[PDB]
Sequence to fold (115 residues):
Amino acid sequence: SMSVKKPKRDDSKDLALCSMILTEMETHEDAWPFLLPVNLKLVPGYKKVIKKPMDFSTIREKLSSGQYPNLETFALDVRLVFDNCETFNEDDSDIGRAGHNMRKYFEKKWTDTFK
Fold:
């Protein structure tokens, strides 16, 4: 509350560390469904169904331009990529499996780096 604070966590490396995680996500062999924004002209139903499209290139641009105020907002966008994927793609499909794989990959890096 006012004048009552927990000890200050060092957040000075967060930006660099989220960048490193994102690089690792970008270079994973199963990243291909997520590298670029879904083409809303060429994929029927995507625009109407997925209210907040997100992809790794868009996260990278937001990260590089100071549009994440903290590491929780960064994680929310990464998770949105996978939540969107599950919304639109059957589990038993290449893209559906890719999304589950990438989510697991992310969540381990996230825990190992920050928890």
